[PDB]
Structures are given as C-alpha cells and as structure tokens.
C-alpha cells in the first residue's frame, strides 16, 4: 500500500530463506533456489528449477563469494521493478 | 504478500503520481513533492521551512534535466531498503 510497506515486505522475504542456515545476512545457493520457487516462479527463471540455478547464482554473485547479500539481491529485484515497468 | 505484488506496488506507486501532468514518464518538482509527503510523513507539522523536494531533486536529478525518471526514483528506493535492513 505505501512505500515503506513494501520495503519493509521485501527485507522480510529476503530474511526469510537468508536466515534459513548459519549465514544469515546471505542467502546461499539451495536458499536461492528455494526463494526462487516459491516468491517468483515461472514469472521470472521459467524454472526447470533443477537445472539453471546456478547460472542465476552467478548473475547475482558479483563479488563471487557463493553467497547473496541483501544488496547484490536488490539489484535484481529494482532490474524486474525496471522491467515491468513498460507498461 | 509476494515480491512481484511489492515490485508493481512500487511502480504503481512512481505512476500514480508521475502522470499528474503530460509528461507521463517522470515526476516533477510538485509531483514528487506530493509523493514524498504522503510516503514519507512528518508528523511533527513545523515548518521551519522544509524543503525535502529541493533537497532530493539534486540528489535524485542525475541528468540534472529536473525531473525525475523511474531509474532515478528506484536509487531512492534502493538506498531506503538498504538503511531499513540494518534497523529492522
Ligand atoms: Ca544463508
Ligand atoms: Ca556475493
Ligand atoms: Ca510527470
Ligand atoms: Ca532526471
């Protein structure tokens, strides 16, 4: 509804498969792969989910550590915002 | 509620105040005054003059072509869910 709620709904779902294991300021490979089944599906990777995680792993993982920080995260989610935005 | 319902919220938000005027595609000064008023309240009504639009266009208006773009917009938005993330 306002701005701020939906910050705040996107920093909850992040933090909900990020805190899944030990590393919890990341999201790590199967994390991603979970978050990636179930908040945006065949909308976005047209999952054959166990095949091309990893290549998604990859376009996030810009310091290339195996782990997805929030940011490296939002520069996903704002390149969708920016997608969809036509029209 | 999903990430994509949160995604068009925030471009529904950019729109719904965007296309106030003729140029659909960005938010002018009084346009994006409005938006920051009603996303970002100040409940305290004193003004020692507050000139939040001011302050964020020069911030937000990269191309200096005083107005703001989308791409422009989702840089604010993106630094709030960043400082929002360390406070939670
Ligand atoms: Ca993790
Ligand atoms: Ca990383
Ligand atoms: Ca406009
Ligand atoms: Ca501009």
Do not use: G
Request: no cysteine; aromatic share 12%; net charge negative.
């Amino acid at each position: 509804s306002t701005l701020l709620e939906n910050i705040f709904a996107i920093i909850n779902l992040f933090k909900q498969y990020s805190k899944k294991d030990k590393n919890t300021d990341t999201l790590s490979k199967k994390e991603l792969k979970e978050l990636l089944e179930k908040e945006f599906r065949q909308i976005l990777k047209n999952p054959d989910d166990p095949d091309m995680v990893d290549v998604f792993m990859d376009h996030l993982d810009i310091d290339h550590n195996k782990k997805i920080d929030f940011t490296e995260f939002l520069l996903m989610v704002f390149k969708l915002a920016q997608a969809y935005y036509e029209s």
